[PDB]
RNA sequence: AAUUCCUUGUCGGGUAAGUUCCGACCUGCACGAAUGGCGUAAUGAUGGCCAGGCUGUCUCCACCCGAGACUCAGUGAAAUUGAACUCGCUGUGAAGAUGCAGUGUACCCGCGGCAAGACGGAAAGACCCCGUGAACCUUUACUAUAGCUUGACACUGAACAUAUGUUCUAACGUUGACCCGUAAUCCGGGUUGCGGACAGUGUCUGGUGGGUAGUUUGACUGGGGCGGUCUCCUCCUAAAGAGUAACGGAGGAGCACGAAGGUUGGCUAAUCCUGGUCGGACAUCAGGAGGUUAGUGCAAUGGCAUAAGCCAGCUUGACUGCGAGCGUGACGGCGCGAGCAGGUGCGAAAGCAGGUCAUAGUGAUCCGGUGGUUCUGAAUGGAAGGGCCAUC
RNA sequence: GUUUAUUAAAAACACAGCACUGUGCAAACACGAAAGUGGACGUAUACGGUGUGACGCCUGCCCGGUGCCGGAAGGUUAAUU
RNA sequence: GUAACGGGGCUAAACCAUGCACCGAAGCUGCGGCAGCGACGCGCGUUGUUGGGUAGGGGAGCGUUCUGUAAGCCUG
RNA sequence: AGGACCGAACCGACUAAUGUUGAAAAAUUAGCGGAUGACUUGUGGCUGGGGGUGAAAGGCCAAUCAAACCGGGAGAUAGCU
RNA sequence: UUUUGUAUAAUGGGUCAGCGACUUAUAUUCUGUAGCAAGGUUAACCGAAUAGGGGAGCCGAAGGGAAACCGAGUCUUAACU
RNA sequence: CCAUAGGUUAAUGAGGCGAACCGGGGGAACUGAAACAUCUAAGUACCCCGAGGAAAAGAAAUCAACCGAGAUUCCCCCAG
């Protein structure tokens, strides 16, 4: 007859906006994410929704770093 | 919801107010906070009033 | 006869120097307490009509 | 303006502003217009006689638009800082 | 049962055999007392059932008499019709073929017959759905409204008594009587009686008002209806960027919090084992094992130890103006944001703070309200109203 | 008896009878912006409306709901002021 | 109505493997012609390339009646 | 005596067959009901369209009826063919 | 013609001839073309006057701001990097 | 009872028709609003009355804005 499902939320367009080696202007969003899947490295800020954004003009650099092998995003300015 | 809107009115007599919500039942004491009044351009005591 | 202005559009849009239209932002009439100051502050200045909408505005305002 | 029944743009946006009655009776005079009046006195009446401004204009302002190269007396009109410099540069007077 | 779904109920009668009929039973799905109950002689082109008679109704048709049909002479229609050199079959194919393929059959043309096909003719399917179509009907749908009804004021006055009561006459009524116009009963005038400021009518006003009128009465949908659904968040479907459907599979939201926010300083979980007043499986205490299997104000996912988890001090950055740049949207919008100015909190300081681990907790515009602001102010000064800012 | 002229003649409609109810006469009611007219040249043994439907035996319980009828102390309440 | 190779027929004219022939389209090439677009030269040549089309957009024309040109021109 | 009986005229229309580009836009043929009555019929009159009239079928109101016909608003509107 | 798709057994047409459907007015924008050019152009009207007159107007050469107002700037803000 | 109503006679005028235009008394709905009620259509269609060669309007208890204009009517602007 009827079903109790049939709901879903709008897709949030998360994920990587600027990949490795891409030249960005300061302020450019590099990744939108839920929590810190990626962490802010050098010249990268972490917004209130865990958005990583460039704090300097330069090139995006993904790196695995530290004792937990966490993924950091940096900007090579 | 439960929480009702209030205005925080400037003690400087500028007319300037902030607005916020308040659970009136759990907290009946008047909300008082130092907030920036942009008319006098100073932090002054703001006090709760009706919206 | 003369085309009639859509008078509601004339109250919402003003033509700018290069033939664009400025309008006031939606969402700043009421239900303001819940809105962030940042959000409301960005809604205060007038904005330009987007490319998708200029055709609709121009149709409504032949004497703008 | 019909969008298929979606609230159209000219209704989902707020009305703003009011129309000034004073703006309708206010004009702007270019520096180029100053040499088009007869006699080299630029008043409200001399501009109206030269068909620079409409007959119902009560207020007029000379702006720095175009150029002036004659001594013109400007009387009873507002003048911009740039227009005033240009009028005075060409030997004119701004009478208020 | 004109009512009984189950049901051809069951029992009895009638028949060789009876879902009907008649008589009962009561288990009345869902009789029932004037939208009458139960009877009832008579009546009925009324419904059901049985029997005698009667018969071509039938077994099962035969023959005959007439009117057509058939032939000749005369007259002379019609519906229909893209064009036709207009076969069968099996297959194919807008899925049921004269027309395609393959194959079989078939000399050319009438006439009388028959209706299997030409999805034959006839009527832009009446069912069904759709259209923000129509009509008429209904009502405790909406909005009106005739009518009915309420009061105020008017036409409408006078005494006396304590806004009401009584009395009065002169307005007003009279579809009482009489007189005259008059040859008329209508009507008007006159006289007189009876009512009498009442009634009645106008304007305004509350009620009532399917009597009447105009209309509304959503969409999605494996047809429609019924049910469910409609915005927002999380996961999966989703094919390792983004996005991605179904009445696909699972759950949540329509808040909470002046601390559960800011900052400084500090801290680290579940669970179990061993021992220990009451005390048990589980309370609190002690040690160890363990290593987040906990925790997160609330779903799920992604996060989280430098904790984002837990505790305390001091606090109001849950600041105001802005904003390089970027994300995400058809758009309206929504989001992230360093940095700048002002002023602030915490910290010795570096610093951190423009709410909350993040992602739901929402509503355009119009209309109007409140506060601020001489921006505007229809001769002028004001004001009203409008604008702008804040907010409802 | 009546009825769907032209697919329904009936169990439908009507009917005498019954009941409820309104109506005091310028009747109620109806047709009429109104004047008037019907009701009726009638007058409650009359007239209108409604339901039932010869006759026989009868017609039980419920007034909470919706109407209607009566009440009106009090609550609420229009124009007006 | 054969009716589950399209048929005839087939013991290969079936299937598998290998190989070389050939047939086969409006594909490609040849020859002649037309047009679009673009070069490179001087509207012409040379040369490259393109030319299936519904909705639909763009470009360029034919013919018809009428007015001027026309009291002209053609026409018993 | 009788909305009494049988049955012609007269009024009707229950059944069947025919007819269905009819002889006929409702009939013919054989049967059928009423036939002194709430009967039937001639002539004339009155009622008018949200109106009439209706022993009530939404029947009938000129072969037209859940709102006649004619003319007008009028080229209504038609997101449909 | 309509369609995802029609020899379709979906639609329309018996045939011929004639007629039969994107117009007209005004406004507005864009393109082409012509005139004039920081100007361009007149409307009614006058004029027998397609002339000539008529520049009332309209558009343009300045914008910004809700507005006062300022003006190659302006608005925003106490003030802008 | 005066009188009046009423009655008769005389004179004068009216009556009816007509396409539009005009002034007045009444006055829709379809339609549009993508439904619909406010609103629209529209004071339109239509009905009625009255007039004239035209009608109506008209000689400021009008505008204006501190300057001024000078009855009414009609046309172009103002201005979608
Ligand atoms: K980016
Ligand atoms: K029953
Ligand atoms: K009853
Ligand atoms: K064949
Ligand atoms: K046949
Ligand atoms: K009297
Ligand atoms: K009275
Ligand atoms: K009603
Ligand atoms: K479906
Ligand atoms: K199905
Ligand atoms: K805290
Ligand atoms: K700061
Ligand atoms: K009968
Ligand atoms: K009761
Ligand atoms: K009618
Ligand atoms: K179809
Ligand atoms: K068909
Ligand atoms: K054009
Ligand atoms: K041009
Ligand atoms: K600037
Ligand atoms: K209407
Ligand atoms: K519509
Ligand atoms: Mg998701
Ligand atoms: Mg690490
Ligand atoms: Mg506001
Ligand atoms: Mg001028
Ligand atoms: Mg049964
Ligand atoms: Mg039985
Ligand atoms: Mg039995
Ligand atoms: Mg038998
Ligand atoms: Mg029985
Ligand atoms: Mg019953
Ligand atoms: Mg009863
Ligand atoms: Mg009965
Ligand atoms: Mg076949
Ligand atoms: Mg034959
Ligand atoms: Mg036959
Ligand atoms: Mg057929
Ligand atoms: Mg059809
Ligand atoms: Mg109704
Ligand atoms: Mg309507
Ligand atoms: Mg409707
Ligand atoms: Mg639907
Ligand atoms: Mg993906
Ligand atoms: Mg992928
Ligand atoms: Mg897609
Ligand atoms: Mg914290
Ligand atoms: Mg927290
Ligand atoms: Mg949270
Ligand atoms: Mg309004
Ligand atoms: Mg004033
Ligand atoms: Mg004034
Ligand atoms: Mg009978
Ligand atoms: Mg019949
Ligand atoms: Mg019959
Ligand atoms: Mg009477
Ligand atoms: Mg009965
Ligand atoms: Mg009873
Ligand atoms: Mg066989
Ligand atoms: Mg070839
Ligand atoms: Mg080729
Ligand atoms: Mg080709
Ligand atoms: Mg081509
Ligand atoms: Mg010619
Ligand atoms: Mg008899
Ligand atoms: Mg009859
Ligand atoms: Mg007979
Ligand atoms: Mg009899
Ligand atoms: Mg008889
Ligand atoms: Mg019926
Ligand atoms: Mg008839
Ligand atoms: Mg009707
Ligand atoms: Mg019309
Ligand atoms: Mg039409
Ligand atoms: Mg189909
Ligand atoms: Mg084909
Ligand atoms: Mg087919
Ligand atoms: Mg066909
Ligand atoms: Mg065929
Ligand atoms: Mg069709
Ligand atoms: Mg056909
Ligand atoms: Mg300007
Ligand atoms: Mg006359
Ligand atoms: Mg509509
Ligand atoms: Mg006159
Ligand atoms: Mg004066």
Q: Is residue D10 part of a domain?
A: no
Partners of C30 on chain B (C-beta within 8 Å) are none
Neighbours of D17 (CB within 10 A): 10
Domains identified in chain D, total number: 1
Report yes or no: A61 and A27 within 8 Å, Cβ to Cβ: no
d(Cα D3, Cα A57) in Å, to the nearest integer?
Answer: 42
Report yes or no: D78 and D61 within 8 Å, Cβ to Cβ: yes
Best C28, C31, C33 member to test B by mutation, with max B CBs in 10 Å, is C33
* Token pair recorded at residue C19: 């033939």
DSSP assignment of chain C: -PPPP-HHHHTTEEE-TTS-EEEPPSS-SS--TTS-HHHHHHHSS-EEPPHHHHHHHHHH-TT-
Q: Is residue D35 part of a domain?
A: yes
d(Cα B36, Cα B18) in Å, to the nearest integer?
Answer: 10
> Protein footprint on strand J: which nucleotides are under 7 Å from a CB?
34, 65, 79-80
By what method was this entry solved? cryo-EM
Partners of C12 on chain D (C-beta within 8 Å) are 10, 13-16
Give me the CATH number covering residue D68.
3.100.10.10
By Cβ distance, the residue of D3, D8, D13 closest to C24 is: D13
Chain-chain contact of B5 with C33 (C-beta, under 8 angstroms)? yes
* Token pair recorded at residue A5: 């499902």
Neighbours of A27 (CB within 10 A): 11
CA angle B5–B8–B14, rounded 5-degree value? 135
Which residues, at least 6 apart from B50, have a Cβ–Cβ distance to it below 8 Å?
B6, B7
| Distances, alpha carbon A41 to alpha carbons A15, A38, A47, A61, B30, in Å | 17, 9, 13, 9, 45
- Residues forming beta bridges with residue A61, ordered by sequence position: A74
Positive or negative, the Cα torsion across A8, A14, A15, A16? positive
Q: Is residue D1 part of a domain?
A: no
Positive or negative, the Cα torsion across D75, D80, D83, D88? positive
Domains identified in chain B, total number: 1
| Distances, alpha carbon A55 to alpha carbons B23, C1, C25, in Å | 40, 59, 30
Looking at chain A, how many residues does it have?
Answer: 77
Residue with structure tokens 């001594």?
D71
Helical segments of D1-96, H only: 9-12, 21-24, 44-49, 81-89
* Token pair recorded at residue A43: 């010249």
CA angle A30–A36–A40, rounded 5-degree value? 55
d(Cα D49, Cα B21) in Å, to the nearest integer?
Answer: 65
- State which residues form the domain around D88: 22-94
Q: Is residue D43 part of a domain?
A: yes
How many beta-carbon pairs below 8 A join chains C and D?
43
The CA-based diameter of chain C, rounded to the nearest angstrom, is: 49
DSSP annotation of A72 reads E
Ligand 85 centroid to residue D42 C-alpha, Å: 51
Which residues, at least 6 apart from C9, have a Cβ–Cβ distance to it below 8 Å?
C57, C60, C61, D1, D10
- Residues forming beta bridges with residue C57, ordered by sequence position: none
- Give the chain B residue nearest C33 (alpha carbons): B19
> Protein footprint on strand I: which nucleotides are under 7 Å from a CB?
25-29, 38, 55-58, 61-73, 76, 78
Q: Which residues have beta carbons under 5 A from ligand 24 (an ion)?
A: A 66, 68, 70
């Amino acid at each position: 007859g009827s079903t109790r499902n049939g709901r879903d939320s709008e897709a949030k367009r998360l994920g990587v906006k600027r990949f490795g080696g891409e030249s960005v202007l300061a302020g450019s969003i590099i990744v939108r994410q839920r929590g810190t899947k990626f962490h802010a490295g050098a010249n990268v800020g972490c917004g209130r929704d865990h958005t990583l954004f460039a704090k300097a003009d330069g090139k995006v650099k993904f790196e695995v770093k530290g004792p937990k092998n966490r993924k950091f995003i940096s900007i090579e300015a | 919801g439960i929480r009702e809107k209030i205005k925080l009115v400037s003690s400087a007599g500028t007319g300037h107010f902030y607005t916020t919500t308040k659970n009136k039942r759990t907290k009946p004491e008047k909300l008082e906070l130092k907030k920036f009044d942009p008319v006098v351009r100073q932090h002054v005591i703001y006090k709760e009033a009706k919206i | 006869p003369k085309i009639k202005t859509v008078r509601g559009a004339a109250k919402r849009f003003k033509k700018t120097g290069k033939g664009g239209f400025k309008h006031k932002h939606a969402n700043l009439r009421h239900i303001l307490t819940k809105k962030a100051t940042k959000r409301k502050r960005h809604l205060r200045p007038k904005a330009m009509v987007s490319k998708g909408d200029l055709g609709l505005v121009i149709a409504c305002l032949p004497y703008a | 303006g019909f969008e298929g029944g979606q609230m159209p743009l000219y209704r989902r946006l707020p009305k703003f502003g009011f129309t000034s009655r004073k703006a309708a009776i206010t004009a702007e005079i270019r520096l180029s217009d100053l040499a088009k009046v007869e006699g080299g006195v630029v008043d409200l009446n001399t501009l109206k006689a030269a068909n620079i401004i409409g007959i119902q204009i009560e207020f007029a302002k000379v702006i720095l638009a175009g150029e002036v190269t004659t001594p013109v007396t400007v009387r009873g009109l507002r003048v911009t800082k740039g227009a005033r410099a240009a009028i005075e540069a060409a030997g004119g007077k701004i009478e208020e």
